[PDB]
A paper describes a structure:
Adeno-Associated Virus (AAV) is a small (~25 nm diameter) non-enveloped single-stranded DNA virus in the Parvoviridae family (genus Dependoparvovirus). The icosahedral proteinaceous shell is composed of three capsid proteins. These proteins (named VP1, VP2 and VP3) share an open reading frame and differ only in their N-terminal residues. We use a high resolution (2.5 Å) cryo-EM structure to analyze details of the molecular interactions that are presumed to be key to efficient infection and are likely to be relevant to serotype-specific tissue tropism.
Gold standard Fourier shell correlation (FSC) curves indicated that a 2.5 Å structure was obtained for the receptor bound dataset and a 2.1 Å structure was obtained for the native virus. These are the highest resolutions achieved for AAV5 structures to date. When comparing both of the reconstructions, there was almost no change in the viral structure upon binding AAVR. Following least-squares superposition, agreement of the new complex structure with the prior structure is reasonable, and excellent compared with the uncomplexed AAV5 structure at 2.1 Å resolution. With high resolution structures of both complex and native virus, interactions can be analyzed at the atomic level.
Numbering used by the authors:
A (entry chain A), B (entry chain A), C (entry chain A): 209 to 724
The structure:
């Protein structure tokens, strides 16, 4: 519309209406003119002693809007209301608006650097609706809408890795270059705005409850089974049997089995002792791909990284967040007191402990001359009649991930937790349209000098979430997430004396309980 | 209709119409009177040092029409048009016609053997629509419609193995005998024809594209993750963490995992060195069934048998064709220069290398007195969040396979590649109706002398295929299958000076690329 | 409309719809105020030892939009899709939009030079619909829309040569001066835009296929002709004849002849030896006009500048591009490794080799006392029953050329390749409207001082192309353009580490084959 007329209003709120909740989040963003308006082939050979760090790709002059983290939409109090009252939830729709665009021109005349807004300049915006570009959004990276509403953020630069040759920095003939200008996009001057709507595909509810029963003890403890078990052989070798008694869950016949597991080194936190001076990398779990070895945190779903009351943690099977955002590219050493370390203990009644053996199988054929032998295993995958709980989601964790397009997959549930989608919210890309400097003579060579500038504006994201009601008959009170602190010096989830947002703990989702 | 009137015309063609393509193939066939009009119990004990070669079954006087190979329908040029332009395809319908039947009577009078056509003789034809007979068609056997249209072929004899006892040649009380005359069938004299139509069940498109991205490096290489990792313990044992940086794909948290794998010995081709004088059989991968050991080429889907640029091949995880048809029952030794050896390298960005370890797990519990230990594994099956590409299909490979009827299975994708069907094109059986010789006296004993004869005619198969369009935004050119030869002495996919059809290479399907 | 409202969006895309394809290209342009708002008579005498370099003309303060190069509309991948699947194509319509205009005023106050946009300034635009101005667009000059979308370009200055006297720098009484202000034009301020539509006249499809047969061997090689030939005279002089046999293509009677030819010196590239220290100019092909000698590359259509597999090139009958844009007016020496040298070998089955003799004629009257004599010719023009292929078009080559208006011409097919048009896309001219500086006193003398400024904006061009489908019955696979590189260090047709667009090869159009 015009220079002196706002193109949108500030919407931040949450509205609960029975079985649905609508969250609205608005934030102020800033967008730098990355790579000075050009694409740059980027790459890397081995780094830190691993050719898995090798890659070939491109960086683009584009930035993107990422809102794939629960805290970008949920305030702590709203998150508490959710996890303390519902058995599950799931996203249904999404609406995004970008408005109140302002383009500023920066000039360093004799070192006084003045910032003046350029009224006739534009930004370009488009969404990759058909997923024709590498989808970098569901990979746990930085640059999402901030958790605290007043915080202004910088949009991350869009870049991607394509195929690299023989674990080197070189491309292959199958490496692909994607040109973002080769998509239609809207051009906005200061009076214009941009809007976009989307609907999520049908996905299962996240399970925000914890088993109030152990998978191996579903049988009635007051009744014996009508099934018997082999317990030994007489002095001759004639097999003998005993009836499985009531309560003897060690022997009861079972219908269902725990989820798959892959042993993951257990470490001790707080008041726990560990092997000193160890360098983690060499003994970490790995998976080989294209002739290289990669660490695969947090490991496939199916296990619990820690037992309730225990201080042992299968750290590679854990989601570990920082209690605050850190500078980019830092190599500083962090200790437990600076980290938000999550625990999947709610799942222990059905998910196997990650730092223990999964079980044992028979390793030979017994005979009059050979005693039966057994052997433990450190990994077991999916078997029929298997059941397990997916990783929990957290206020500071990711919401969804794109299921890779290959034509085949099994149980597309994202390892980092959340919702696996075939058609996730599309990439929303934006960039500052280049404005050429004083060019006075012709040349068939592409212009190189550009007036330096950056853009800023607001962004609103509104999401509707469907809720699954709690229909429990438990008589005694349940566990609830509570604001429990002792002799506080500050309020958690609030700005400090300097205005920095403080969050001392990760908030999961499983407080309510349900029997199996 | 009549003796002097043709009962069908020659249809060989292909018609492309947007999202569909219709292929038509006609061929001349010849049918011998197998087993001289009788069923013969067939069997075998151990052979070549393996009781897995033992079997019990029957051979029948029937022949069958098999057209379960891509080249029976696709000409090389049409195959090239397909693989260079589409992201996938799948069969939709099938129509078969058998016509222009001619029955010839052979007589060896004093060794002059004259061939005269018997106008009053018939052939019988029927299709096993309800799958009540052993389905032998999707098992990589010979006798399919020839790839080159002018070639006349012999119909293979129908036979099957039922249950054999304790890996011997003896039957069991559960062994079943199937009598093909116990089905209704059409009888055709020289003026008659036979027609049949069929529709394929809904099946997924074959993926005829290659990942242009590595499964473990989907993250944006310009942005760090907001997740941290355990990297070591201080001189006391207090765990320490580091932020996962941009591009360090060796450490990035991952959402998805590669497909399942089972280590398969890697061998070298061409300019590669191998252990000399080895006898393959003993160290080949195996699976036990009913007290016996079987080789299971080409292994379950999920792996790549070779890396791009590498000359190493997990030969037991490879589809190996001959560059021409060989005589039946040959035991000649073949070298690489006579074989069409396929490579699944297009899948390397998501399928694990078959001749390498899959990865490593933790093998103990670390402690102040014990350093953490890890151990590699040679096989890992399906885990949640797993993704992979099925084996590719080839111009000379099979199209479909029947899913065994057992009431339980997982991801029915045929190991040899193609489409797994519950109700595949039915067996189309045909045989020469017996004509008794000069019988002059009665006997309650079944007649044994029969006028010797064989039949010949044409067969047409028409298939409609649905195509999935390529919707790519890749800027730079893609790889395409091309007729690239240097200083040729002959044209590949053409008859030679003697008329024999020459095919020097296997043509896969994955040339186009798509990001993940 | 207004200052803070965009007047157009970014459209870059391609849409294939059966027999048509629509390409859209948008680019950012910059326009200098050429000649400081005035016309300048320009001229030149002899230069480099040639009075053909003499000319008389004018330079104007106008710039023009040129999009007469295939790569301005086709991306490499789209070009590959075109040439690998169609037998021909042709342009049908064109739509152009100029928008998001920004006019900047430059001021050098004490050497700090500030750039500020002048909101009340205009640019003027008009198209020469009636072709009343010299048409400079179809002459292989620089300044066309860039091949790579993100590249910003400078608009070339409009100028033309009229008639010069006796190969000197002087005008003639017939020399004409054209004043561009003497045309109606639109004036646009920052909120305005300009649009224009055009339809191409009916033109033949470009032939994007290659003959799979030799023009002189169309006869059936298994059958003799019923025509005979004179082969000699007996010892007396009585003529003798022989029947033309099957396959003897050297003697067969022919119905059709190759295209016209004019011998062009052949040079060797790569591993080929050439006469050293030669200065090309003196022995180059020429044509005389108005008392002067001109080089006429790439020579009239009808010949092939090179044979398949041969390293010899009739360089003056070749289109030679640079693998990147070079500065204006450069006199640097370029070697083969920096050039994109094209080859017309696809046409060799019908176009005569340019560096060979065309053939030979009889040069005398034989007699009992004089043996028959023959003589080779170095040039032969059009004869009845002549057939040939026009020059191929290239991704980096021109699309069309204006047919000179003289009232007479033959086969208006542009030597540089492309489409010869009588009414081609009109010249689209634009310039910065002059803004006078501080003038304080009257004078009948035309104002000379002007506020210095330049303009910038976007330009979109959309073209619809009609396609001719490939209807081939060739059995074996065809040749296809493919992204085939060995051990690449960079991706061709992609920006390098510095962002510069790299194109290492010229892509022609003739990959598919058709018989004659």
């Amino acid at each position: 519309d015009g220079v002196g007329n706002a193109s949108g209003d500030w919407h931040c709120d949450s509205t609960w209406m029975g079985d649905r909740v609508v969250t609205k989040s608005t934030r102020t963003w800033v967008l730098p003119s990355y790579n000075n308006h050009q694409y740059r082939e980027i790459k890397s050979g081995s780094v830190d002693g691993s050719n898995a760090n090798a890659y070939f790709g491109y960086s683009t002059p584009w930035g993107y809007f990422d809102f794939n983290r629960f805290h970008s939409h949920w305030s702590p109090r709203d998150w508490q209301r959710l996890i303390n009252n519902y058995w599950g939830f799931r996203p249904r729709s999404l609406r995004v608006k970008i408005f109140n665009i302002q383009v500023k021109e920066v000039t360093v005349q004799d070192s006084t650097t003045t910032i003046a807004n350029n009224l006739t300049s534009t930004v370009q915006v488009f969404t990759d609706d058909d997923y024709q570009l590498p989808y970098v959004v569901g990979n746990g990276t930085e640059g999402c809408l901030p958790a605290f509403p007043p915080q202004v953020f910088t949009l991350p630069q869009y870049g991607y890795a394509t195929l690299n040759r023989d674990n080197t920095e070189n491309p292959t003939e199958r490496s692909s270059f994607f040109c973002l200008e080769y998509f239609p996009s809207k051009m906005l001057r200061t009076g214009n705005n941009f809007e976009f709507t989307y609907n999520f595909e049908e996905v299962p509810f996240h399970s925000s409850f914890a088993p109030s029963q152990n998978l191996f003890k579903l049988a009635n403890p007051l009744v014996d089974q009508y099934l018997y078990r082999f317990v030994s052989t007489n002095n001759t070798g004639g097999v003998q049997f005993n009836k499985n008694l009531a309560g003897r869950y060690a022997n009861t016949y079972k219908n269902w089995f725990p989820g798959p597991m892959g042993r993951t080194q257990g470490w001790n936190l707080g008041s726990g002792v560990n092997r000193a001076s160890v360098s983690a990398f060499a003994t970490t779990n790995r998976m080989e791909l294209e002739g290289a070895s990669y660490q695969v945190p947090p490991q496939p779903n199916g296990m619990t990284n820690n037992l309730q009351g225990s201080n042992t943690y299968a750290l590679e099977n854990t989601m570990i967040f920082n209690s605050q955002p850190a500078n980019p590219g830092t190599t500083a050493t962090y200790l437990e007191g600076n980290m938000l370390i999550t625990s999947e203990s709610e799942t222990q009644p059905v998910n196997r402990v990650a730092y223990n053996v999964g079980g044992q199988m028979a390793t030979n054929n017994q005979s009059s001359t050979t005693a039966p032998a057994t052997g433990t295993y450190n990994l077991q995958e999916i078997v029929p009649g298997s059941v397990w709980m997916e990783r929990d989601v957290y206020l500071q964790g990711p919401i969804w991930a794109k299921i890779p397009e290959t034509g085949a997959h099994f149980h597309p549930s994202p390892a980092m937790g959340g919702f696996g989608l075939k058609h996730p919210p599309p990439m929303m890309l934006i960039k500052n349209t280049p404005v050429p400097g004083n060019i006075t003579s012709f040349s068939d060579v592409p212009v190189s000098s550009f007036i330096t500038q950056y853009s800023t504006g607001q962004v609103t994201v509104e999401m509707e979430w469907e809720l699954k009601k709690e229909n429990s008959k438990r008589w005694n009170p349940e566990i609830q997430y509570t604001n429990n602190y002792n002799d506080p010096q500050f309020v958690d989830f609030a700005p400090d004396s300097t205005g920095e947002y403080r969050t001392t703990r990760p908030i999961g989702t499983r407080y309510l309980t349900r029997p199996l």
